[PDB]
């Protein structure tokens, strides 16, 4: 079934998603995108690590599948299965075609082959949030996943708290007051606009000035 991945490497054709014109397409190889303790609060896992791309390329679905298993298998055995939260930030929507076969070129439009992603320079692929002490396992976990993909990518330690869009000291300023409350997986913040009645329903620790 599979051709070599070198053929469907570069972004040549326009985006060709599954719709009412394409209709009949095969299922994605990757299925579940979140792994580890995904019912964990925001306060548990501060230290964030990314796996950022550095090329304008196409990662296939089954390339992500093996990369997702390999990183999981190492990090589970070493540090235990509930010491992290892995998230895949790339979904394959682009359908690839194949000219599987009146004549050679006398009428030639390709059948659907398989799915793929479209990654850009500076785009994040993988993301892991963990404890402070358990850094080395996460960096070495994403090392082996780097081999399964084509092209060049680099691991980066983030300055932000977890998956939040807030810096290390910035999150502490707001959480020490009553300006943040936990949602479930992510988190909700106070806003200075809105109705003042239902701004007091939530955030009852704020509107006090004491502790």
């Amino acid at each position: 079934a599979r051709r070599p991945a070198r053929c469907y490497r570069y972004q040549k054709n326009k985006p060709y998603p599954k719709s009412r014109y394409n209709r009949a397409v095969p299922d994605s190889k990757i299925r579940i995108y979140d792994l580890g303790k995904k019912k964990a609060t925001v306060d548990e896992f501060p230290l964030c690590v990314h796996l950022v791309s550095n090329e304008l390329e196409q990662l296939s679905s089954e390339a992500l599948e093996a990369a997702r298993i390999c990183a999981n298998k190492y990090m589970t055995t070493v540090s235990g299965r509930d010491a992290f939260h892995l998230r895949v930030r790339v979904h394959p929507f682009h359908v690839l075609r194949i000219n599987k076969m009146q004549q050679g070129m006398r009428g030639a439009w390709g059948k659907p082959h398989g799915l793929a992603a479209r990654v850009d320079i500076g785009q994040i692929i993988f993301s892991v949030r963990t404890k402070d002490s358990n850094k080395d396992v996460v960096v070495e976990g994403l090392r082996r996943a780097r081999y399964k993909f084509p092209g060049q990518q680099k691991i980066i330690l983030s300055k932000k708290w977890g998956f939040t869009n807030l810096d290390r000291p910035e999150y502490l300023k707001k959480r020490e007051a009553g300006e943040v409350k936990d949602d479930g997986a992510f988190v909700k913040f106070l806003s200075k606009k809105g109705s003042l009645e239902n701004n007091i329903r939530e955030f009852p620790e704020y509107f006090a000035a004491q502790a």
Binding site: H50, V52, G122, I124, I156, S158, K159
Partner: protein, 159 residues
Amino acid sequence: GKSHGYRSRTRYMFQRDFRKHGAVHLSTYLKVYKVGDIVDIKANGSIQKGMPHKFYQGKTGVVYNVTKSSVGVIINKMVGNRYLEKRLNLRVEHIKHSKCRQEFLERVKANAAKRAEAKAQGVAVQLKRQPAQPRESRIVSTEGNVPQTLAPVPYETFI
């Protein structure tokens, strides 16, 4: 096969804008058109009668004829290696006055005022427009405004 109908490739061109559907406002109908007036052609999609062909969307021309609920516009279309004089029949919904010519007639009244006032004042006119000239010298003070020193910043990631 191929397809070249009267309204081919006009999906977005006779669309009605966002939150501007329904009946047209009445100043459209009260605007008076004489012969010799310059007019722009923009096709209202809600009215089907007296509609221009897609080519003439955007084009501008002169009025030559006035009738009951329409006007006669004359446009120059280029074809091959020459221009042909083409005569349209549009309803007033697909038309409006060109504001470029409105601006021009104001400048002629202004020139009549300048030349009449110049003779009463005492010679020297100068009425043509001049383009944007190169600017003159000056002395910029540093009082309460001393130059702040900048330099190129180092590289950081933040991702």
